[PDB]
């Protein structure tokens, strides 16, 4: 029922730090602020880790063998993760701002550039168990003079050479007996050094500086040691080198400037292989894959990632996430995609299973406030603050309609008719509901009556009435069809600010500014019951709050509500750090989730640190800006007191935590929450939980396998359902033969009908037995059709996943087969040539 866990973080591709490839080159590890997303680019499957830091990540490094993953945030706090387990092995504090991590190419020991010191530690084995203190130190070198900005291992693992704001590079040997072989330093640059790299036979060293110069060092004569033989320069005027990388087997130098450019040189001899433009912001990180074919570029301003194959100039991927600008959410009527409406004036259709954006629409000028689909997943509607509401056709990608008012108010919420003929939008500038027809572009009516702005709209589908709820402290139900045109108001205790309607259409759930979810019947306007939701809310102290979180009431209500598709639970979320999952017939909460434990937002903690508070003021409300070494990162583009408009630079405050929208998924037991760090997607594993159903002393996996070996398929399937073990259901499901499928599917019990429907849907969207799954679906729908058509709400989010399977992965095989058949008929039937 309600065992959710943090599955995915969707809609954020890269924010800040270090972008890594897998050793095979198939997976791409990128840091969102705390967590780390991993994209498997071949199988098209992403995930993100459940653990998270307390501050933004500054470093990532994965082992060669793909076993261990060290992620270091800002200010030292490393976490060592077991990778193929997805589980945190150890926490270790390095107390200075760590600039770089890198394992050795052997794998045995890792280096760490932290301060002006080079630290070398030994890795813990993964085949062993957890220790109190697994990190055993190797050495700490302290030759440099200022902060160390880069770190590179030799190909054999016996040399490291580092790079620092000393304007200098330095070779250390790992072994004390090879100190004398390599104990040296390299001077001569002018601004910094930003990279130092070995050749593929380590007899040449290339060192690149922030000034824009590459020195080729070689161990030659004029007994003789380490001259500069060549000084090549990039002749960029305003651009500065921001990130360098080097693949030594193919001799590739990939440089990324602060103008947007990246250049690829060959470098024993400095030939411009390519010069391209990632964007119009700085380029903040470069990486290569092990073969040397893919180059991963990342920028932090606007937060984008670009994986580029450079032999044929081809973008493998070009994605751009979002941070603190996501005003609304919707699912496709499937578990396929999520459509987000974001403050930049953009709408993005994101996939789920491979967390990338499939499409972007960019026609609204200002921020897009809300987005809905029709009662079909081909057309969506969006409502924005430029005073317009537009329709979009997701087959030929065009806004075919743009409805506007007359007196140009700016629209906040919208709602679209099930029978897709009517779109009604409500604003806060006018508090009348404006309703347009969809086919003809005209506006039908302005439903008036609300005193004070309209906060939420919704269309009750299975009877088609309109529920509009407003700061009037009033719900109002309009019946706008059938020649009557009649209203009925309901009065609530506070000004309502969220609304949802049951799948039946029989009840409305409202969410008020007093901290109450109320639930009303809609035939008779009487109140059915309310959930009081004010004490199960985690509110936070801001860094600039002069009052306690206990007394603060900016965040003790919910501003988004969604009924489940059963109709039994509500998800709820507002301007606070907790998302709540409630149970309507029992008016008691099932669970509470804590959306972000990142101290670099604001409303996260309840109790700040009095060591940070001085008698001057908080140590965290001091301008750390003008200490910076960059004119562009030092200036302040802000406006006094503005919020919620424009870029994250235009407000001089720490971006708060909030959840802007929530929905339940239509097909699987998941829910998505559009929040300040992205789209948090929570989902359940019937694989991992043990939740049986009508057990007994005899029901056992051994007894079930005994029943299969004694050929009692109905009994084996029913025992596997009562054990509710996923591998057991899968074993017996593939173990029964073809000729007994209709008998078994007839004599299956009505209590285990929805369980077998859920199992077939999930297995079929990821399985290769299309014939077996279709035979099973045909037998079940044949045997038990009237039961499902009767219990249309118990089987909604199971038959929806089954429809998804049929349309997504069976109709495509049918398409290919029919095309081949008709092309063969034309090739073999028609006259030839000459």
């Amino acid at each position: 029922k309600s065992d959710f866990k943090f599955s995915n973080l969707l809609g954020t591709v890269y924010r800040q730090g270090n972008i890594t490839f897998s050793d095979d080159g198939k997976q791409l590890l990128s840091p969102v602020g705390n967590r780390v997303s991993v994209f498997d680019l071949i199988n098209n499957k992403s995930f993100t880790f459940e653990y998270e830091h307390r501050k933004n990540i500054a470093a990532i490094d994965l082992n060669k063998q793909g076993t261990l993953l060290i992620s270091i945030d800002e200010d030292g706090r490393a976490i060592l993760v077991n990778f193929k387990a997805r589980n945190v092995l150890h926490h270790f504090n390095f107390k200075e701002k760590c600039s770089a991590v890198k394992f050795s190419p052997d794998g045995r020991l890792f280096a760490l550039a932290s301060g002006r010191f080079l630290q070398i530690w030994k890795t813990p084995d993964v085949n062993k168990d957890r220790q109190f203190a697994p990190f055993v130190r190797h050495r700490v070198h302290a030759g440099h003079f200022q902060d160390i900005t880069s770190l590179t291992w030799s190909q054999d693992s016996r040399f490291i050479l580092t790079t620092s704001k000393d304007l200098s590079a330095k070779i250390w040997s790992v072994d004390s007996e090879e100190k004398n072989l390599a104990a040296t330093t390299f001077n001569g640059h002018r601004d910094y050094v930003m990279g130092a790299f070995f050749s593929h036979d380590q007899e040449k060293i290339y060192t690149v500086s922030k000034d824009g110069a590459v020195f080729v060092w070689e161990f030659t004569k004029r007994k003789y040691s380490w001259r500069i033989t060549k000084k090549h320069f990039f002749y960029a005027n305003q651009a500065k080198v921001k990130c360098v990388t080097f693949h030594p087997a193919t001799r590739l130098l990939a440089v990324g400037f602060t103008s947007g450019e990246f250049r690829l040189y060959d470098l024993p001899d400095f030939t411009l292989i390519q010069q391209l433009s990632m964007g119009q912001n700085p380029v903040n990180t470069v990486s290569v894959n092990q073969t040397g074919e893919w180059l991963a570029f990342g920028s932090s301003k606007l937060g984008q990632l670009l994986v580029y194959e450079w032999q044929s100039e081809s973008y493998i991927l070009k994605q751009q996430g979002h941070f603190d600008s996501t005003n609304s959410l919707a699912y496709s009527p499937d578990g396929s995609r999520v459509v987000t409406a974001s403050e930049d004036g953009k709408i993005k259709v994101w996939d789920i299973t491979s967390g990338f954006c499939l499409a972007t629409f960019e026609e609204h000028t200002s921020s897009v406030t809300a987005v809905q689909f029709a009662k079909r997943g081909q057309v969506m509607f969006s409502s924005s603050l430029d005073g317009t509401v537009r329709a979009w056709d997701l087959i030929r990608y065009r806004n075919f309609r743009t409805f506007t008012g007359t007196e140009r108010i700016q629209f906040n919420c919208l709602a679209v008719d099930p029978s897709g003929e009517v779109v009604c939008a409500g604003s806060l500038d006018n508090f009348d509901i404006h309703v347009w027809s969809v086919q003809t572009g005209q506006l039908l009516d302005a439903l008036s009556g609300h005193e004070g702005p309209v906060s939420c709209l919704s269309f009750s589908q299975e009877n088609s009435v309109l529920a509009s709820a407003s700061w009037d402290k009033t719900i109002r139900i309009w019946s706008i069809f059938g020649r009557s045109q009649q209203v009925e108001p309901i009065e609530v205790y506070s000004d309502v600010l969220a609304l949802s309607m049951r799948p039946d259409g029989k009840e409305v759930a409202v969410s008020t500014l007093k901290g109450q979810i109320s639930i009303f019947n809609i035939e008779d306007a009487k109140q059915v019951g309310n959930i009081d939701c004010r004490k199960d809310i985690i509110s936070g102290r801001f860094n600039q709050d002069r009052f306690t979180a206990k007394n603060s009431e900016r965040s003790k209500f919910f501003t988004t509500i969604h009924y489940s598709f059963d109709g039994m639970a509500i998800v709820a979320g507002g301007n606070n750090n907790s998302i709540c999952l409630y149970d309507v017939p029992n008016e008691v909460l099932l669970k509470r989730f804590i959306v972000s434990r990142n101290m670099a937002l604001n409303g996260t903690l309840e109790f700040l640190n009095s060591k940070k508070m001085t008698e001057a003021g908080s140590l965290d409300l001091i301008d750390d800006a003008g200490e910076n070494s960059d004119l562009e990162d030092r200036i302040d583009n802000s406006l006094p007191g503005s919020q919620r408009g424009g870029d994250l630079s235009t407000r001089k405050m720490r971006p708060e935590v909030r959840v802007t929208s929530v929905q339940f998924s239509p097909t699987a037991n998941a829910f998505a929450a559009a929040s300040t760090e992205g789209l948090l997607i929570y989902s359940t594993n019937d694989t991992i939980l043990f939740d049986p159903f009508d057990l007994d002393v005899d029901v056992t996996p051994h007894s079930t396998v005994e029943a299969l070996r004694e050929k009692q398929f109905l009994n084996a399937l029913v025992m596997a359902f009562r054990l509710n073990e996923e591998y057991l259901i899968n074993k017996v499901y593939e173990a029964i033969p073809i000729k007994e499928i209709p008998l078994v599917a007839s004599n299956i019990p009505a209590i285990y009908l929805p369980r077998i429907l859920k199992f077939i849907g999930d297995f079929a969207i990821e399985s290769q037995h299309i014939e077996f799954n279709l035979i099973w679906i045909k037998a079940l729908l044949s045997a038990s059709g009237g039961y499902i058509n009767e219990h249309k709400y118990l089987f909604s989010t199971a038959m929806r996943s089954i429809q998804r399977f049929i349309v997504r992965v069976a109709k495509e095989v049918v398409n290919t087969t029919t095309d081949n058949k008709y092309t063969y008929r034309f090739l073999v039937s028609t006259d030839g040539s000459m």
Partner: protein, 848 residues
């Protein structure tokens, strides 16, 4: 006695154990090595944060400790280990069987005195090396020269001299030659301690009466004699701040400070450590600071300061008494009840038989307060009646905690030994709450429970009654009289729907809670001594008295499992965080891990010491147990969380791998008649079908800039025959009329490779390559796997060479190949039949 799931992490909550600690100076900073059973721990001194702990437990207990700059010499049973940063950098095994008793390092020599009065002197090998390594000599003290060796000291400015102080006299040994040089006049008392004074030649000697002898060594004459009466002197320290003070810590709990110039006693700190646990076992002034670190045997280490004087001219006469400064501590007695206090596995509650409730920390060992038993001022108006001699509560025998309403009212309910009521506690303030909860039938609180929402507390007494108190206002609501023996377990569902109780009349009673009815009354055989409720699966477990664990589903209301196999009483047990295992520790010194689905014991540990509490983490990662002796909490981890664990039966031996590791790899193809798809991503077919337009959208907007000089063969210059392999394999497959290897390589090929080879087939001559390719695809469609891939390969062939075979239509070979193709494709239209039916009926069912 090893395990297969759990593995010991560390034992949490100990500070000291009565072995005299040692102080080690680093640069200008100090650390403190304290002994805790077999491991030691290295504490900072400016803050008392736990820096280091020993990484491997010793084979026996640690007798002595000493600490040079970076190195720590720990003398356990027969050996001496030389550790640095917790890791054993050298071992020094002695050549006897008698245990090591004392240990003193100085210079290049390490002097270790085993208990039969023989001192082993070890020497550094090279005078640059860091610890003594080699055997050098074996001195001995016979009976005619001295009694049992009390201590081994070294005085400053003594070339190769080792001051061995015995129970009768003080000896000096030359350690290089190995020759005694001096024997003091025999003291008429028994000497217990020695301590080198920070002046030359002077050692202080504490006896078993009240005497501290200031004894010279250049002359051999008792310079001073300071009498503590009616005490045994246990630890001596001097001051090196610039004031001439002395600290005499007694074996009664007292610590007395003398000024040696005025011959005065400045002060006496009374009862700092318990007399019953040794008293003061070590006191040390830090070197040049007015800070004394005193450690006892009651699992506590303190340190005090001497604030400077309040006068101006007088100064050393008006000395302020020593005030308190930092300290760490734990439990003195073993712990009684533990509980995980949140879902992060950050905090433990631990209530112990010294009547103290602590809040230990599993993240940082300096976050662990003690919860304060300081009552609240009444809300009625009367005066609370107790003793005016303040005391601690009786010991705790049950605890319930619920974090749903934290920081708003109380969320712990504790049941104390032989009292008639429970207490509320508050984990926010770490204080007691303002409500106490009575039973109302003269019965002791035998068990307690809390609602999930944090509103209700259920108290089950020792006469059957269940009282239900609201926790915000701590006010009584209900009372359930089903049992007439005691009530040994209460629980409420997560939906506040049903409520289980279980009691010593062998009775389980399932009540409703939203109504106030009885749903059922189950009677088992034996009495019932414990109940654990897993709410996520609605299964509870009852530990009985015919030595079994009865697992009962609460909804269908009957016994589903009955785990047998314990051979004595069942002390404690708990569920897995997901509902799959029950871990049960029992009084036959065993810990068994039973599996709930298959029903059998999958793991068994034998412990040396009986285990009285066992609690899984609320997260998956930790197991926490606690035993009969030992003042800590043993922490174990999950190999099962980082790996997979087989589920067999082990216990009768020690004391179908699909089903074992409970994973199931799906069949590649069930029948040889049913269709399948490819084993891979479902995007390979769409990419092959639309391989050109996706690359066209991937290419950038503008042209990139290049140079003019470039190597033409740059790819081949990236440094470090006759036929093609695909065509060769197709040719051999045509020769042998077997294309299986060709189809293996075609499924193997990547998107571009496939398009490249299929475009570069040969299509001019009597078309052998096209005929062989279509023959291979017909063999694949007869093989009935990779159906999407063979259909998409034929579509690619028709889009590349459609014009060639269209022009050369009705040629015999291509006609025959296409006829066989059409035969098998006709044979496989049934998939479209299936899809049409399922889509139409599903649409009708869902909408209409």
């Amino acid at each position: 006695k090893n395990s297969k799931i759990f593995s010991p992490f560390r034992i949490i909550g100990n500070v000291s154990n009565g072995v005299p600690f040692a102080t080690g100076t680093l640069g200008s900073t100090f650390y403190i090595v304290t002994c805790v059973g077999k491991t030691f721990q290295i504490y900072d001194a400016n803050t008392l944060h736990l820096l280091f702990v020993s990484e491997k437990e010793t084979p026996s207990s640690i007798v002595a400790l000493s600490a040079h700059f970076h190195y720590v010499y720990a003398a356990y049973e027969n050996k001496v280990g030389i550790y640095k940063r917790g890791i054993e950098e050298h071992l020094l095994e002695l050549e006897t069987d008698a245990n090591v008793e004392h240990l003193c390092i100085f210079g290049d020599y390490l002097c270790a005195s085993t208990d039969d009065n023989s001192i082993f002197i070890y020497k550094k090998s090279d005078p640059q090396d860091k610890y003594p390594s080699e055997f050098y000599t074996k001195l001995t003290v016979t009976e005619i020269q001295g009694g049992e060796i009390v201590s081994l000291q070294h005085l400053a400015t003594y070339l190769n001299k080792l001051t061995v102080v015995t129970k009768s006299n003080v000896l000096l040994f030359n350690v290089r030659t190995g020759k005694l040089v001096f024997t003091s006049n025999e003291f008429p008392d028994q000497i217990t301690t020695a301590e080198p004074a920070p002046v030359l030649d002077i050692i202080a000697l504490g006896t078993v009466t009240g005497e501290v002898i200031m004894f010279n060594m250049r002359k051999g004459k008792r310079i001073r004699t300071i009498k503590i009466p009616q005490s045994r002197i246990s630890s001596l320290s001097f001051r090196t701040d610039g004031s001439s003070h002395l600290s005499v810590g007694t074996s009664s709990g007292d610590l007395i400070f003398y000024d040696l110039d005025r011959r005065s006693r400045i002060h006496v700190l009374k009862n700092i450590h318990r007399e019953s646990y040794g008293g003061v076992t070590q006191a040390t002034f830090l070197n040049g600071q007015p800070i004394i670190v005193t450690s006892g045997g009651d699992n506590s280490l303190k340190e005090y300061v001497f604030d400077p004087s309040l006068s101006q001219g007088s100064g050393d006469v008006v000395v302020q008494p020593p005030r308190y400064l930092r300290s760490r501590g734990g439990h003195s007695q073993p712990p009684s009840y533990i509980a995980f206090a949140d879902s992060q596995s950050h905090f433990m509650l631990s209530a112990s038989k010294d009547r103290s409730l602590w809040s230990f920390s599993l993240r940082k060992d300096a976050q662990s307060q003690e919860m304060s038993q300081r009552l609240h001022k009444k809300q009625d108006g009367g005066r609370v009646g107790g003793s005016t001699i303040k005391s601690k509560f009786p010991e705790i025998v049950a605890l319930a905690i619920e974090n749903a309403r934290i920081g708003e009212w109380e969320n712990i309910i504790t049941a104390h030994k032989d009292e008639k009521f429970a207490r509320t506690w508050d984990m926010r303030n770490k204080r007691v709450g303002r409500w106490t909860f009575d039973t109302t039938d003269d019965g002791f609180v035998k068990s307690v429970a809390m609602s999930q929402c944090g509103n209700f507390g259920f108290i089950g007494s020792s006469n059957g009654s269940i009282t239900i108190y609201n926790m915000q206002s701590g006010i009584l609501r209900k009372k359930y009289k089903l049992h007439k023996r005691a009530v040994t377990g209460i629980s409420l569902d997560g939906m506040n729907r049903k409520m289980v109780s279980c009691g010593l009349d062998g009775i389980v009673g399932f009540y409703d809670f939203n109504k106030s009815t009885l749903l059922g009354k189950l009677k088992l055989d034996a009495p019932i001594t414990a109940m654990v409720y897993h709410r996520s699966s609605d299964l509870f477990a009852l530990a009985l008295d015919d030595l079994s664990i009865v697992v009962i589903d609460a909804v269908t209301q009957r016994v589903v499992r009955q785990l047998w196999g314990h051979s004595n009483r069942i002390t404690a047990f708990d569920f897995s965080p997901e509902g799959r295992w029950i871990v049960s520790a029992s009084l036959d010194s065993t810990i068994r891990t039973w599996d709930l689905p298959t029903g059998g014991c999958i793991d068994g540990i034998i412990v040396d010491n009986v285990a009285t509490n066992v609690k899984f983490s609320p997260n998956g990662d930790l197991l926490a147990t606690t035993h009969v002796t030992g003042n800590g909490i043993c922490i174990w981890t999950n190999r099962a969380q980082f790996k997979t664990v087989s589920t067999r039966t082990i216990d009768e031996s020690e004391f179908l791998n699909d089903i074992d590791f409970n994973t199931y790899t799906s069949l590649e193809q069930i029948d040889k008649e049913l269709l399948t798809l490819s084993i891979g991503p479902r995007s390979k077919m769409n990419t092959l079908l639309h391989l050109d337009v996706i690359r066209k959208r991937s290419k950038p907007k503008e042209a990139p800039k290049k140079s003019e000089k470039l190597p033409f063969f740059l790819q081949l210059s990236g440094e470090k025959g006759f036929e093609s392999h695909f065509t060769k394999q197709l040719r051999e497959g045509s020769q042998s009329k077997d294309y299986s290897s060709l189809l293996a390589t075609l499924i193997n090929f990547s998107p571009a490779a496939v398009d490249l080879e299929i475009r570069s087939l040969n299509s001019f001559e009597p078309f052998d390559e096209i005929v062989w390719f279509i023959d291979a695809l017909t063999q694949g469609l007869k093989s009935n796997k990779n159906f999407e891939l063979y259909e998409t390969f034929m579509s690619l062939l028709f889009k590349a060479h459609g014009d060639v075979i269209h022009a050369n239509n009705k040629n015999q070979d291509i006609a025959s190949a296409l006829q066989n193709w059409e035969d098998v494709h006709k044979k496989e239209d049934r998939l479209d039949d299936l899809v049409k039916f399922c889509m139409g009926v599903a649409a009708f069912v869902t909408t209409a």
